[PDB]
Amino acid sequence: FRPISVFREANEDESGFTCCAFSARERFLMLGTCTGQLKLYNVFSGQEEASYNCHNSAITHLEPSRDGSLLLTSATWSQPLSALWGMKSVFDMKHSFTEDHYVEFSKHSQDRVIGTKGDIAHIYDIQTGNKLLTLFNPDLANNYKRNCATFNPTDDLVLNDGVLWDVRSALAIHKFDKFNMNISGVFHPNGLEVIINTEIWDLRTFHLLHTVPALDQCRVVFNHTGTVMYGAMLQAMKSPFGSSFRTFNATDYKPIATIDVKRNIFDLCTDTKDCYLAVIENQGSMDALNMDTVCRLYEVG
Ligand SMILES: Fc1ccccc1C1=Cc2ccccc2C2=NCCN12
Numbered sequence: 001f002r003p004i005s006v007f008r009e010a011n012e013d014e015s016g017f018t019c020c021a022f023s024a025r026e027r028f029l030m031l032g033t034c035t036g037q038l039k040l041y042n043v044f045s046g047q048e049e050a051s052y053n054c055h056n057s058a059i060t061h062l063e064p065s066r067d068g069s070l071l072l073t074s075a076t077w078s079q080p081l082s083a084l085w086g087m088k089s090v091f092d093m094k095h096s097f098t099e100d101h102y103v104e105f106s107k108h109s110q111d112r113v114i115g116t117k118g119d120i121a122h123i124y125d126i127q128t129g130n131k132l133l134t135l136f137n138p139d140l141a142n143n144y145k146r147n148c149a150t151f152n153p154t155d156d157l158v159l160n161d162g163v164l165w166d167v168r169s170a171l172a173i174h175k176f177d178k179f180n181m182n183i184s185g186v187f188h189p190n191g192l193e194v195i196i197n198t199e200i201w202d203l204r205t206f207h208l209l210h211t212v213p214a215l216d217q218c219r220v221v222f223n224h225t226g227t228v229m230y231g232a233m234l235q236a237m238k239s240p241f242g243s244s245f246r247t248f249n250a251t252d253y254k255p256i257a258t259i260d261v262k263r264n265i266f267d268l269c270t271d272t273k274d275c276y277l278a279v280i281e282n283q284g285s286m287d288a289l290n291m292d293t294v295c296r297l298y299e300v301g
């Protein structure tokens with residue numbers, strides 16, 4: 001993990017980066033801030049290129065669309081809580097998702113959003129904004145405190161609150177048992193496995209394949225090719241993770257590295273070419289008057 005670049009929010013005695021994601025434009029990182037701003041930075045020079053006020057509370061999440069035309073955001077205590085922005089010529093609000101605390105794009109064909117409200121997953125048409133599906137069954141719920149609904153890599157299955165759902169039928173096909181209070185899980189990119197906290201489940205048999213105790217309370221991100229997996233552990237403003245990230249071989253779940261940066265982590269994300277990891281670190285402690293985050297850029301391959 002060769003450090004390539006570091007930078008703080010321009011013209012701020014208190015740097016307030018809270019999340020990041022590479023833009024579809026090579027060389028440029030998108031960051032959310034604690035004042036609800038979207039910033040475009042050159043990742044190598046640290047130069048601020050653009051700024052827009054998306055929300056009047058802190059950004060918690062953002063996801064750019066792979067064609068470079070759309071952007072999802074989620075805030076903290078804003079109504080609306082999440083939104084979809086156009087970035088073709090003018091930066092403008094397309095649609096808002098009043099109470100959804102988290103949103104993603106579909107993966108294969110990026111023609112939907114999926115948004116999460118507590119235990120309840122909402123699927124929307126991007127062109128109309130219209131709500132096509134509510135996926136929720138009160139008898140199968142796990143009530144995960146950090147539930148994040150997500151599409152599989154072909155868009156035909158949804159994981160919501162530890163329940164696998166067929167989309168076309170709008171039926172629940174399997175409830176994974178609850179083994180932690182917080183993490184609800186993600187699809188591997190290979191379409192065959194589900195990662196729910198420390199449990200890796202087969203999608204063909206619903207058997208446990210692997211136990212990975214190091215993944216406990218981690219948010220997980222894959223490289224583009226899906227051969228490497230990075231995890232940063234939640235804490236037991238306030239930094240959402242601790243000071244260390246783990247990296248795993250994505251095909252057998254054997255550890256490659258444990259990095260302590262010695263500074264609490266807000267986010268981490270991968271470029272499209274499996275070259276870089278970008279990490280938001282806080283230089284302050286939680287007790288500090290204010291935040292002081294940087295972005296670091298690491299060569300990996
Ligand atoms: F915890 C989460 C679970 C699922 C999705 C997003 C988050 C999250 C919460 C958060 C809270 C305060 C400041 C920054 C963040 C943040 N930045 C990127 C990830 N993230």
Ligand SMILES: Fc1ccccc1C1=Cc2ccccc2C2=NCCN12
Nearest residue numbers: 157173174191192193203204205206
């Ligand atoms: F096996 C099952 C028994 C009962 C209900 C469903 C399944 C199942 C779900 C699935 C989901 C995503 C990818 C592959 C699969 C799969 N492969 C074999 C069977 N199977």
